[PDB]
C-alpha cells in the first residue's frame, strides 16, 4: 500500500513509489534520484512511464536494465508539461542526478517535493525566487539541532590535506576510498587529482561512473587497478581484515594504507572538530571516518524553511514514530513563530 507522503493530490502522480506494485490512478512515477530506498522495487519488467533526470536515466537503463521506451528523462530549470499538468525539476544538491520537483497543480496550489537534498542558499536563486510554494515535501533527514557538521569543502580539505602528507612522507603508501552507492564522489576525485594518479575501481562500479556526466571522466578513472594508487573499495572491506586482504593483492607494491570512510552524521560530531580528527590504526593500516554530508544539517534546513515560507510541511523522513513526528512538528512550529509567518 502507497502511503499518502508519496501521492501528489489532484494529479496521476506518485514520487519515489515503485515498491508497492500497481498504484491505483497513477499515470506517471517520478524519481527524485537513484538510490536504492527510493527505486525499490524498479527491474526490467517496469512497464509505465517514468520521469526523472538525464543522468538517473542513464543509470535506469543500464545498471537496471529498464526499457527506453519508458524512461522520459527531462532536462533542468526548464518549464515542462507532463499529462496536462506543468513540472519543474531542479537541483537537490545531493548525489549525481538527483532532484527536487515543482508541480504547479491545476486547481492553483503550488507543491514542492525536494527529494533527499542539502539545502544551500544558492536555491534561493533559483527558479523559487518568484513564487508562493502551498505544499512543502520536505527531507527531514536531519530535523534536530543536535546535528551539526562542517561544509563539503571543509571536509574535502582536511581529506586532500591528509592524503598528501601521508603519501610525501612514505611514496609506498596506497590510499583507498569506501563507496555502497552514487554520491560522494568529490572524497575519491579531489585525493586523485592532489596525487596526480585516476582512481582504480571494479568493472561494476566504472560502469556506474560512466553513468555520471563527468566532465573529462576519462581522464579521472580506469579499471587498471596497477596503474592507479587510489583504489575504490566496498564500504563493508573498510576495515583491518578488509584492507589486509586488499593490500596481499597488490604484489608487493606497497607497505601501508591510508583509508577513508565517508559517513554521514555521527556522534563523535558533538565532541570533535573536522581539524582535530584522528584515524584508528592497527599497524601499518589508519582509517579515517569523515563526516561529509549530502543531506542538510539542522541549519541549514531551517534557514531554506523560514526563507520559502511554505503554508504546510508534510514530513518524508523520520515519520515512522509518534516521538520524531511530535519533534519534527515543535521545530516547523518553532520556525513559523520566530519568522512570522
Ligand atoms: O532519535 C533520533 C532519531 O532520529 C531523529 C531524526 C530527526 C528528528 C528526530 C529523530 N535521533 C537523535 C540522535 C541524537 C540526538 C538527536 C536526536
Ligand atoms: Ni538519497
Given at each position: 500500500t502507497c502511503p499518502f507522503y508519496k501521492k501528489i493530490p489532484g494529479t496521476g502522480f506518485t514520487v519515489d513509489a515503485?515498491?508497492?506494485?500497481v498504484v491505483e490512478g497513477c499515470t506517471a512515477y517520478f524519481l527524485?534520484?537513484?538510490?536504492?530506498?527510493?527505486?525499490?522495487?524498479?527491474s526490467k519488467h517496469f512497464t509505465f512511464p517514468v520521469y526523472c533526470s538525464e543522468i538517473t536515466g542513464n543509470l535506469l537503463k543500464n545498471k537496471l536494465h529498464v526499457q527506453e521506451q519508458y524512461i522520459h528523462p527531462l532536462p533542468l530549470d526548464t518549464e515542462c508539461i507532463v499529462n496536462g499538468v506543468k513540472v519543474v525539476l531542479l537541483d537537490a544538491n545531493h548525489c549525481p542526478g538527483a532532484v527536487?520537483?515543482?508541480?504547479?497543480?491545476?486547481?492553483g496550489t503550488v507543491i514542492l517535493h525536494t527529494g533527499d537534498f542539502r539545502a544551500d542558499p544558492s536555491m534561493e536563486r533559483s527558479l523559487?525566487?518568484?513564487q508562493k510554494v502551498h505544499m512543502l515535501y520536505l527531507d527531514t533527514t536531519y530535523c534536530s539541532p543536535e546535528y551539526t557538521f562542517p561544509s563539503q569543502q571543509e571536509v574535502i580539505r582536511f581529506a586532500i590535506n591528509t592524503a598528501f602528507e601521508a603519501v610525501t612522507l612514505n611514496p609506498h603508501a596506497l590510499v583507498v576510498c569506501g563507496t555502497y552507492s552514487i554520491g560522494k564522489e568529490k572524497v575519491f576525485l579531489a585525493i586523485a587529482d592532489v596525487l596526480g594518479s585516476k582512481v582504480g575501481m571494479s568493472q561494476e562500479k566504472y560502469k556506474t561512473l560512466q553513468c555520471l556526466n563527468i566532465p573529462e571522466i576519462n581522464s579521472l578513472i580506469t579499471t587498471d587497478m596497477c596503474s592507479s594508487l587510489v583504489h575504490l573499495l566496498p564500504m563493508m572491506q573498510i576495515n583491518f581484515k578488509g584492507l589486509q586482504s586488499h593490500l596481499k593483492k597488490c604484489g608487493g607494491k606497497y607497505n601501508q594504507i591510508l583509508a577513508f570512510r565517508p559517513t554521514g552524521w555521527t556522534h563523535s560530531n558533538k565532541f570533535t572538530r573536522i581539524a582535530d580528527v584522528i584515524p584508528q590504526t592497527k599497524g601499518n593500516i589508519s582509517i579515517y571516518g569523515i563526516p561529509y554530508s549530502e543531506h542538510?544539517?539542522?541549519?541549514?534546513?531551517?534557514?531554506?524553511?523560514?526563507w520559502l515560507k511554505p503554508q504546510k510541511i508534510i514530513p518524508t523522513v523520520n515519520v515512522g514514530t509518534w516521538k520524531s513526528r511530535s519533534t519534527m512538528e515543535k521545530y516547523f512550529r518553532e520556525w513559523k513563530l520566530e519568522a512570522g509567518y
Amino acid at each position: 500500500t502507497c502511503p499518502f507522503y508519496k501521492k501528489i493530490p489532484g494529479t496521476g502522480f506518485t514520487v519515489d513509489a515503485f515498491q508497492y506494485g500497481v498504484v491505483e490512478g497513477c499515470t506517471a512515477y517520478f524519481l527524485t534520484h537513484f538510490h536504492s530506498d527510493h527505486y525499490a522495487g524498479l527491474s526490467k519488467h517496469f512497464t509505465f512511464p517514468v520521469y526523472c533526470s538525464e543522468i538517473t536515466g542513464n543509470l535506469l537503463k543500464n545498471k537496471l536494465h529498464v526499457q527506453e521506451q519508458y524512461i522520459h528523462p527531462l532536462p533542468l530549470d526548464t518549464e515542462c508539461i507532463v499529462n496536462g499538468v506543468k513540472v519543474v525539476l531542479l537541483d537537490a544538491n545531493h548525489c549525481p542526478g538527483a532532484v527536487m520537483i515543482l508541480f504547479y497543480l491545476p486547481n492553483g496550489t503550488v507543491i514542492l517535493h525536494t527529494g533527499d537534498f542539502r539545502a544551500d542558499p544558492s536555491m534561493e536563486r533559483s527558479l523559487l525566487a518568484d513564487q508562493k510554494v502551498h505544499m512543502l515535501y520536505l527531507d527531514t533527514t536531519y530535523c534536530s539541532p543536535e546535528y551539526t557538521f562542517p561544509s563539503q569543502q571543509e571536509v574535502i580539505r582536511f581529506a586532500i590535506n591528509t592524503a598528501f602528507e601521508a603519501v610525501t612522507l612514505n611514496p609506498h603508501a596506497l590510499v583507498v576510498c569506501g563507496t555502497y552507492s552514487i554520491g560522494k564522489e568529490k572524497v575519491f576525485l579531489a585525493i586523485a587529482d592532489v596525487l596526480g594518479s585516476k582512481v582504480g575501481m571494479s568493472q561494476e562500479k566504472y560502469k556506474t561512473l560512466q553513468c555520471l556526466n563527468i566532465p573529462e571522466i576519462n581522464s579521472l578513472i580506469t579499471t587498471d587497478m596497477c596503474s592507479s594508487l587510489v583504489h575504490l573499495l566496498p564500504m563493508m572491506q573498510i576495515n583491518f581484515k578488509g584492507l589486509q586482504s586488499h593490500l596481499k593483492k597488490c604484489g608487493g607494491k606497497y607497505n601501508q594504507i591510508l583509508a577513508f570512510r565517508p559517513t554521514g552524521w555521527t556522534h563523535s560530531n558533538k565532541f570533535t572538530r573536522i581539524a582535530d580528527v584522528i584515524p584508528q590504526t592497527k599497524g601499518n593500516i589508519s582509517i579515517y571516518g569523515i563526516p561529509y554530508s549530502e543531506h542538510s544539517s539542522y541549519l541549514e534546513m531551517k534557514r531554506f524553511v523560514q526563507w520559502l515560507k511554505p503554508q504546510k510541511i508534510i514530513p518524508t523522513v523520520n515519520v515512522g514514530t509518534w516521538k520524531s513526528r511530535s519533534t519534527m512538528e515543535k521545530y516547523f512550529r518553532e520556525w513559523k513563530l520566530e519568522a512570522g509567518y
